[PDB]
Design a protein around this nucleic acid. Structure first.
Lengths: 83, 99, 208, 100, 127, 151
RNA sequence: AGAACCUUACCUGGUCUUGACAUCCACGGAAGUUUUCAGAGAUGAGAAUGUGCCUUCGGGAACCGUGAGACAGGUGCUGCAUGGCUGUCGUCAGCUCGUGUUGUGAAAUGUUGGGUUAAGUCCCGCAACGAGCGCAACCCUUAUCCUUUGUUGCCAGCGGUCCGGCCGGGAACUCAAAGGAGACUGCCAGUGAUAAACUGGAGGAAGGUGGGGAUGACGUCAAGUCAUCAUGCCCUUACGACCAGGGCUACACACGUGCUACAAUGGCGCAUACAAAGAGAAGCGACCUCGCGAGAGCAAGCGGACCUCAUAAAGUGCGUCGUAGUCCGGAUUGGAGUCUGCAACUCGACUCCAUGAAGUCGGAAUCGCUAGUAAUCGUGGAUCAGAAUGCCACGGUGAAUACGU
């Protein structure tokens, strides 16, 4: 994981977007590619459709999800089974 | 005292350069220390010689950098000044240093 | 790729280096590139002039070139006219004060590189490669080579199936280190493709 | 390699040349433990703002003749293949085949 | 008066000096027992002296550099033998007979490209 | 090899007792070029054996050896469709080595804890004409006897 | 000889089209320097400075801008069109030619035969006589000696000592390079065809090519490489160019090559000894301070026989464990962290604490090695911000066996 002294990581533009949504009080999904972005307290409640390489998959945020990153909840590979 | 560090790839050439500087020194001044041979640096290199793939196919080159330490104990007026006009043969990096 | 390069194996004993200068690991690659650049330029310029060997030698932040060419005056042109022009562009290529010398090549038939160039030229102007090769070998021998070998490869006579052919005369010892084997190469960019020309010339054994 | 790749690299090199002072200053700021938190944050965000090609860790060493990325050597600035050619042809000073 | 012999074996270079005395051996300002913990090394350094019964007769001062232990001991012995030769010159034959005069030219064989070691070929397989 | 026989290389006798056979034994025992340990082990065993059987160290070792040396071994000629084992008289240099190797293998096999102790037990057995090395020796002899028809 | 980005050539989207890279004119602007908002970025819109080399002033060379085309570009196809380079039989002792002669001729002879050699090595014979490429020698390195030169290298004998070659010094020794000597079956005996040789021994540091390397004949495999490079159909508002993210790291499985193990010739703990060979300025980084540690802070010495990397490990001595899936073994997973780097999610290395799989020497079968070799122990280097159990180098310890074909 990242160093504690560096702080968390979140993409600036994504942070901005989150701030705007908070200001608005809207619940329309924000489509995003920043899979590397960590998740914050203020983003709880928002839906945020994270890119998985192919498509944006909606991620409704939860309290439990804070420390994690957005890409963790947007699996990229699609394996069903070998038979 | 003037330390002089001669460096070159060719050893005959460096030897020639050592001699010549020694002569330059000896005529003008007095008590040239001497042409001390330091260790040679044998920088080796391996490379694949195939254009695409044959890994055991290789060539191993090297460059032998030779060092000669020449020292002058008494810097006079005439002697140090000689060297300025007395340039050496090419491919021989000299390095003088007084004190 | 069986054989070792005849110059390369002999650089320590009987053959000398072309680029002859010293530095520290800092400035080497830069100077190597400078040498490449100048040499490339000179090849481009003095193509019509029969030039065999460019020798770069840079002491004291100043580059000294030495061009070994068979016919100097074409390189020199009018006395100190063409040489001067070359010098300034060389300086520009390097970024230092330049000094050009021109060595005059006695017996261009015995210089391997020149011979290869001539053969390449002949091939370009559509002669029988075989006849060019015989001319080369014969001339060298006439001039007093202890031996010569030449070899040409690929799309000979525009044939679909490429093949190589070579002609030796005299003695051309390659395993013998002390032998003076001037080796060089060239390429004919014909309509049908490239034709590679190698030539070895045995000027004799050195005793030391 | 392609011409385009060589061009990209040249560009990257130019950018590294350009932004060295600023990027180094920013790195220093970020490192400096005896410094304000907000300042450190500003510095890391500012680093983000700068172009990516500005980084030295982006530029790949290629052969100065062919631009071949692999098989590179630093002392000569050439890829193994062209280096060998140089040794053979006599144009690398001092270099000769080594045995021991 | 002190006599001298250089010793040399794998990468070890001993400087043996012989003097007349009681038979105390010093190696880099340490005793034979101190410097060589190995008995085999002690044996090899002493060997020439046993061969020619000059153990009590002469002291020897040594300084040795390079190599490991066994090689260092062999270099020491070589230097000893050389110094015996210089000293008596009538002892040459028995030293020859023993095999001490010979410099053991066995160096380590360099590693060779292709191979994992001097001679160990990597594992082969037809398939 | 095909072309030339070569002279066997020189071997130094061991420091403690000054003997070639022991040095050869320690060499055989050794592993990974670790000589000092192997010879320490050999010495330890020897000391234990000497304690057990009385006699000198060396003498006891020699006795134990004697009891596992083979007079004859067998080799595979196979000129026929099926293979034929043919006895052959084994030469002085070889037989000693074989007995050593055989002792050492037994020591490796045994169930006791320390290597030196195991070697010691093996030597005692050989002296007494039991153990493992003596059995294998017997087996070798027995095979030769069976194939005595071939000569 | 090193995929986080880059590399990258692939995918997804977002974008450009004389273009990222060149030359050419036309004509708009000195180049360039600084800063602003939107955008994932590519890009798309703003604010300050400058006018330098020269003009019977229709303007110029560097460096941006726009349009036309000529062109650029292609890691696109063909290695079965090619050059160059490479593997391979094989460092195998062979492969050839000229002239002569034999044969209608394809061809033969030489080059076969007696011996001998590592060798088409050498002698002897002989319709062969000669020559070339090769097997040999010339080169590097290593093993002994001598001369020269002695610092940053050395300390035998001298004086002083902080008992450190550290400081007066000394030039001996090691060592460092430079130049010489030395090994040639040269000397002795026997065998041999009045031989080439072989077998032994003397000396010698080295003995019969002393050890190792480099060196690869004519050719073979339409062997490999058009993605290093070069080079003789196809794409050209896209098979070219720019960007962000992803992938090249996927995972029912099969194989190759390695590392670590299964333990006591060992593990663990404490003490302690002996190397070589290298690298180092956007670099190596002492000492001191802090941190359990990875490291962090401060910061000399050093382009380096001087300083740094940098403590060699195996070893040796003392203790413990006592044959257990263990004080063997370390995979795996959880936590917490350090550094590089815009950036360690995919996907880095390393550290600490926890966790403690399988594995008790491995079926058929199969590989390497003849000596300082194998085996085992550590050390360094390249590529390289970071990222090796791989590769290339270095020394330590150091065997077994070769009857024979």
């Amino acid at each position: 994981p990242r160093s504690l002294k560096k702080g968390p990581f979140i993409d600036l533009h994504l942070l901005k977007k989150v701030e705007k949504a908070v200001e608005s009080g809207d619940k329309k999904p924000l489509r995003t590619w920043s899979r590397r972005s960590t998740i914050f307290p203020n983003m709880i409640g928002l839906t945020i459709a994270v890119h998985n390489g192919r498509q944006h998959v909606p991620v409704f945020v939860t309290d439990e999800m804070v420390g994690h990153k957005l890409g963790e909840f947007a699996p990229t590979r699609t394996y069903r089974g070998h038979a | 005292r003037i330390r002089i560090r001669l460096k070159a790839f060719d050893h005959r050439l460096i030897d020639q350069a050592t001699a010549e500087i020694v002569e330059t020194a000896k005529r003008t001044g007095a008590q040239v220390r001497g042409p001390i041979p330091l260790p040679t640096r044998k920088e080796r290199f391996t490379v694949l010689i195939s254009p695409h793939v044959n890994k055991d196919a290789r060539d191993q080159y090297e460059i032998r950098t030779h060092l000669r330490l020449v020292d002058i104990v008494e810097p006079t007026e005439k002697t140090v000044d000689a060297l300025m006009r007395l340039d050496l043969a090419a491919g021989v990096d000299v390095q003088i240093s007084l004190g | 790729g069986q054989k070792v390069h005849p110059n390369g194996i002999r650089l320590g004993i009987v053959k000398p280096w072309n680029s002859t200068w010293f530095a520290n690991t800092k400035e080497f690659a830069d100077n190597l590139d400078s040498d490449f650049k100048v040499r490339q330029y000179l090849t481009k310029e003095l193509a019509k002039a029969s030039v065999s060997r460019i020798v770069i030698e840079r002491p004291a932040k100043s580059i000294r070139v030495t061009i070994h060419t068979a016919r100097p005056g074409i390189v020199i042109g009018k006395k100190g006219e063409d040489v001067e022009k070359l010098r300034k562009v060389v300086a520009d290529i390097a970024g230092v004060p330049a000094q050009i010398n021109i060595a005059e090549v006695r017996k261009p038939e015995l210089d391997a590189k020149l011979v290869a160039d001539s053969i390449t030229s002949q091939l370009e102007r559509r002669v029988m490669f075989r006849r060019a090769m015989k001319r080369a070998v014969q001339n060298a021998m006439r001039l007093g080579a202890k031996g010569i070998k030449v070899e040409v490869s690929g799309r000979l006579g525009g044939a679909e199936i490429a093949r190589t052919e070579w002609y030796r005369e005299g003695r051309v010892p390659l395993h013998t280190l002390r032998a003076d084997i001037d080796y060089n190469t060239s390429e004919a960019h014909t309509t049908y493709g490239v034709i590679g020309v190698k030539v070895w010339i045995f000027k004799g054994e050195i005793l030391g | 390699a392609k011409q385009s790749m060589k061009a990209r690299e040249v560009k990257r090199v130019a950018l590294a040349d350009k932004y060295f002072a600023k990027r180094a200053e920013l790195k220093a700021i970020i490192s400096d433990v005896n410094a304000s938190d907000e300042d450190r944050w500003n510095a890391v965000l500012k680093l983000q703002t700068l172009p990516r090609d500005s980084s030295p860790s982006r530029q790949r060493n290629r052969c100065r003749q062919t631009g071949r990325p692999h098989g590179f050597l630093r002392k000569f600035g050439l890829s193994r293949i062209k280096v060998r050619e140089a040794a053979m042809r006599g144009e690398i000073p001092g270099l000769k085949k080594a045995s021991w | 008066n002190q006599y001298y012999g250089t010793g040399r074996r794998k990468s070890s270079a001993a400087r043996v000096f012989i003097k007349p005395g009681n038979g105390k051996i010093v190696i880099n300002q340490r005793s034979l027992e101190q410097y060589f913990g190995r008995e085999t090394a002690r044996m090899v350094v002493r060997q020439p002296l046993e061969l020619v019964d000059m153990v009590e007769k002469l002291d020897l001062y040594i300084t040795v550099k390079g190599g490991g232990i066994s090689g260092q001991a062999g270099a020491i012995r070589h230097g000893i033998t050389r110094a015996l030769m210089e000293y008596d010159e009538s002892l040459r034959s028995e030293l020859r007979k023993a095999g001490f005069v010979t410099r053991d030219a066995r160096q380590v064989e360099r590693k060779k490209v292709g191979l994992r070691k001097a001679r160990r070929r990597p594992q082969f397989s037809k398939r | 090899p095909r072309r030339r026989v070569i002279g066997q290389r020189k071997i130094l006798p061991d420091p403690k007792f000054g003997s070639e056979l022991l040095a050869k034994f320690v060499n055989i025992l050794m592993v990974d070029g670790k000589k000092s340990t192997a010879e320490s082990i050999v010495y330890s065993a020897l000391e234990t054996l000497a304690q057990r059987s009385g006699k000198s160290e060396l003498e006891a070792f020699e006795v134990a050896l004697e009891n596992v040396r083979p007079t004859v071994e067998v080799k595979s000629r196979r000129v026929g469709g099926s293979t034929y084992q043919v006895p052959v008289e084994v030469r002085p240099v070889r037989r000693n080595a074989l007995a050593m190797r055989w002792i050492v293998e037994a020591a490796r096999k045994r169930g006791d804890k320390s290597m030196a102790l195991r070697l010691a037990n093996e030597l005692s057995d050989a002296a007494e004409n039991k153990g493992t090395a003596v059995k294998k020796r017997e087996d070798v002899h027995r095979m030769a006897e069976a194939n005595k028809a071939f000569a």
